């Protein structure tokens, strides 16, 4: 049938971390571009 209601939660958590990971890198890149306009 399906998987644990918490196994779902674990995966959803993992995916979130991946998202937070990529967003952090995007963040940094944006600071670089913004700081270029400032310097």
């Amino acid at each position: 049938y399906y998987i644990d209601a918490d196994l779902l939660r674990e995966i959803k958590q993992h995916l979130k971390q991946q998202q937070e990971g990529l967003s952090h890198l995007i963040s940094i890149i944006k600071d670089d571009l913004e700081d270029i306009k400032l310097v």
């Binding site: 049938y1 399906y2 998987i3 779902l8 995966i11 959803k12 993992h14 995916l15 991946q18 990971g21 990529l22 890198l25 995007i26 940094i28 890149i29 670089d32 571009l33 700081d35 270029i36 310097v39």
Partner: protein
């Protein structure tokens, strides 16, 4: 020309973006409900979780080198400014 090099790094980045995007949306739908979850197995998700983490790793690498590339634009732009504008 740097326009041929740029277009490339940009192009690879766009592929890992699309790659990751498809996979994630795909996996979202499979876990969206138990009705859709029944058409898949716990060994498929296990497969997808890998496919997805592999893209993430490659995507994270591309974002990283993009960061380093922007760091270089700034250094050189800053250098030129000191040479010509100070």
């Amino acid at each position: 020309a740097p326009a041929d090099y740029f277009r490339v790094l940009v192009q690879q980045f766009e592929v890992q973006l699309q790659q990751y995007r498809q996979q994630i949306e795909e996996l979202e739908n499979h876990l969206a409900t138990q009705a859709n979850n029944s058409h898949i197995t716990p060994q498929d998700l296990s497969m997808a979780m890998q496919k997805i983490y592999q893209t993430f790793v490659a995507l994270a690498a591309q974002l990283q080198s993009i960061h380093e590339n922007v760091k270089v634009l700034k250094e050189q732009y800053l250098s030129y400014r000191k040479m010509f504008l100070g």
